Amino acid sequence: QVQLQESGPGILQPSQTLSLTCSFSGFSLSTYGMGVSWIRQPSGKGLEWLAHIFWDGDKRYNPSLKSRLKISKDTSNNQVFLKITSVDTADTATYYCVQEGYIYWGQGTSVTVSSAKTTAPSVYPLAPVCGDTTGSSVTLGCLVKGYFPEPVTLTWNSGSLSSGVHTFPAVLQSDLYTLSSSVTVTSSTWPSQSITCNVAHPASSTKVDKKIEPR
């Protein structure tokens, strides 16, 4: 009904300014009581409110960050903007543009801040230490190490094997992300037919497949 779309930069390094943009249709920043908010959710956690601009030009800020924030509205273009000056690693979040503070949330836009630069990963195989016959089970793994930026697309046997896969989340260790997946299949399955980890990193056009082979 209303359309709220947020546009912003992909990756920003530290030191810089983040310029976000809310474009709204449906409502006027003229209406009595009207306004827009910016809210952000840090990567894996709570939602935090950043700033709020009103119809009457009045602006309201998050008392901790107000020293690095400025909301402005282009009512001729139907845009409001937020500018955070001096981004460091902790403003990695998803910024959402939100009508009168709660009623209509747009989609979000994901900002990553990092010195780091596009490094393709390393696919390392993990085949069993094993102590067989304590199950007719077997788990295998594939650790993807050192890549940037997110994302990677991991499969097993080129997505032929999908049940009893567990792909863990990417955790950025020293500027750089890591990620593992376990696949767990029955003993009749491996080594009888082969298992292959598939990783591809579209931010580098890295496509690797590592056969999991017995030790």
Binding site: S37, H52, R60, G108, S122, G141, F168, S180, T184
Partner: protein, 215 residues
């Protein structure tokens, strides 16, 4: 600030029963006429779907199994009946006074029978050692509840720097969780020791489930 204490932090429900999340505020969020507390649902990955606004008003399309109630300081969301697609984090948010503050969340997880973890350790791959790197992954798959402790032991000692832990969300086929713990060392270091142990401590057992290797 108005501070909203959501409670409980987590809620384990069987499918088909009702659920009650309450959210308490330090001061009234009312106009001594209407009440500004609002309820959000967030399945991981999605943005926050608003469910109920101004204490009781249910958003369009939102299934009338969600009911909102309350004023001034104390509010309650009821999900009745809890269907399988309701598993998420819920937030309450006042927008009465700025700063607009959010509640910390409650995670509604499905309940199941206790399940201990199938742990596995995997030595570093030859490839990683070739690089002078040494990671030791221990995947501790499929368990219920979520509460678990990971201890790494190198030669009878607890080494706990270099440890990366990551966990999955609740498996929607068997309402289980899973975690990978990774110990990272350097080849120099790894070649200087023999036993590597991870020991997953968890309710379903009386003694640390211990999984280790020598060389």
């Amino acid at each position: 600030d108005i501070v909203l204490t959501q409670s409980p932090g987590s809620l384990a429900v069987s499918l088909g029963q009702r659920a009650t999340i309450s959210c308490r505020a330090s001061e009234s969020v009312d106009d001594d006429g209407n009440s500004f507390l609002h309820w959000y649902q967030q399945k991981p990955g999605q943005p926050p779907k608003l469910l109920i606004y101004r204490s009781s008003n249910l958003i369009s399309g939102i299934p009338d199994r969600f009911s909102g109630s309350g004023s001034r300081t104390d509010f309650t969301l009821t999900i009745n009946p809890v269907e399988a697609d309701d598993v998420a984090t819920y937030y309450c948010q006042q927008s009465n006074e700025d700063p607009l503050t959010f509640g910390a969340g409650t995670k509604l997880e499905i309940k199941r029978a206790d399940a201990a973890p199938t742990v596995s350790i995997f030595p570093p791959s030859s490839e990683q050692l070739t690089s002078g790197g040494a990671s030791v992954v221990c995947f501790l798959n499929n368990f219920y509840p979520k509460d678990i402790n990971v201890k790494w032991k190198i030669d009878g000692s607890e080494r706990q720097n270099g440890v990366l832990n990551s966990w999955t969300d609740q498996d929607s086929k068997d309402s289980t969780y899973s975690m990978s713990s990774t110990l990272t060392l350097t080849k120099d270091e790894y070649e200087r020791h023999n036993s590597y142990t991870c020991e997953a401590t968890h309710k379903t057992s009386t003694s640390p489930i211990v999984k280790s290797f020598n060389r």
